[PDB]
Design a protein around this ligand. Structure first.
Ligand SMILES: Cc1ncc(COP(=O)(O)O)c(C=O)c1O
Length: 308
């Protein structure tokens, strides 16, 4: 339900206890129209979401009992489903109610919330709310992580397995993560076929150079964390641009950061074993990350309180 986070840092879990009398406590899944405890959640092996990975999905997070940008996530999920000729069979409002009920039943104040739409065996909608998941550990959110550029892997292009529609087809992402681990790095930043920056295994990459922020426009998910970071940057008076970022620019960056729903804004201290800047989290990354976590507690349109 919780994990250690750096003391006095912007990231702190809620202080509360689960009611274990409820079978729903700690995880809830909605499958084939029925809410279920997460542990028993199961899907037909014959769903083409398995055999063909014929699906799209989104993930939203809950922090301090508030779900973040659920409407944007549902818009993205439904837009991608339409591009894949998938019919969820539920309206955006209906999905929102079900999702929020999954969180409420789990009792989780911090949660990783998944909505998946699959072609099915009749299209299927699967939803779950489970304890908070970290793409990078809390310590790395605060003190930074390490990356490599794969020698042997590139990101799949938009004309193959399209990264702009969120998907479970991680063959290149998994291969890149193994290469990073083999090389002693925490993660990988993948290039596309033209040696432009694409994205990482589970995150977008933002590049800071000369006081400006850039992020890839082509072979990358249009991330909601990235959208949030760009809004924060705009409010700070920083110019933030979605554009092609060349491999030259990646290696020459003043700061690098990974951004994703599961854990937020992660500084990247080094690339290919070479320090980025001073080898510690950059000033713009720190400013944006701290503002991002403040949004989770501030009343506004980006967050909605779950009713437990
Ligand atoms: C491949 C990939 N790119 C980018 C992201 C970040 O997207 P978002 O900020 O909407 O979670 C994710 C989410 O983990 C992802 O899986």
């Amino acid at each position: 339900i919780r994990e250690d986070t750096p003391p006095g840092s912007v990231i702190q879990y809620s202080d509360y206890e689960l009611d274990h009398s409820s079978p729903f406590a700690g995880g809830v899944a909605w499958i084939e129209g029925e809410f279920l405890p997460a542990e028993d959640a199961k899907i037909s092996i014959f769903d083409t979401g398995f055999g063909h990975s014929d699906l799209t999905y989104t993930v939203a997070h809950v922090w301090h009992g508030n779900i973040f940008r659920l409407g944007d996530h549902l818009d993205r999920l439904l837009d991608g489903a339409r591009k894949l000729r998938l019919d969820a069979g539920y309206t955006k409002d209906e999905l929102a109610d079900i999702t929020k009920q999954c969180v409420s039943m789990s009792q989780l104040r911090e949660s990783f919330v998944n909505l998946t739409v699959t072609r099915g065996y009749t299209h299927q909608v699967y939803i779950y709310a489970i304890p908070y998941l970290w793409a990078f550990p809390p310590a790395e959110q605060i003190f930074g992580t390490t990356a490599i550029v794969p020698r042997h892997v590139r990101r799949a292009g938009r004309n193959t397995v399209d990264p702009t529609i969120k998907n479970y087809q991680w063959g290149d992402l998994t291969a890149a993560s193994f290469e990073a681990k083999d090389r002693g790095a925490r993660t990988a930043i993948l290039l596309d076929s033209d040696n432009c920056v694409a994205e990482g295994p589970g995150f977008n990459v933002c590049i800071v150079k000369d006081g400006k922020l850039a992020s890839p426009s082509r072979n990358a998910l249009p991330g909601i964390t990235r959208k949030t970071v760009f809004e924060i940057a705009d409010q700070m008076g920083i110019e933030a641009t979605l554009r092609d970022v060349t491999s030259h620019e990646l290696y020459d960056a003043d700061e690098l950061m990974a951004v994703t729903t599961a854990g937020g804004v992660t500084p990247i201290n080094s690339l290919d074993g070479e320090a980025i800047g001073n080898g510690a989290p950059g000033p713009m990354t720190v400013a944006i990350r701290d503002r991002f976590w403040a949004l989770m507690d501030e009343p506004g349109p980006l967050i909605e309180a779950i009713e437990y």
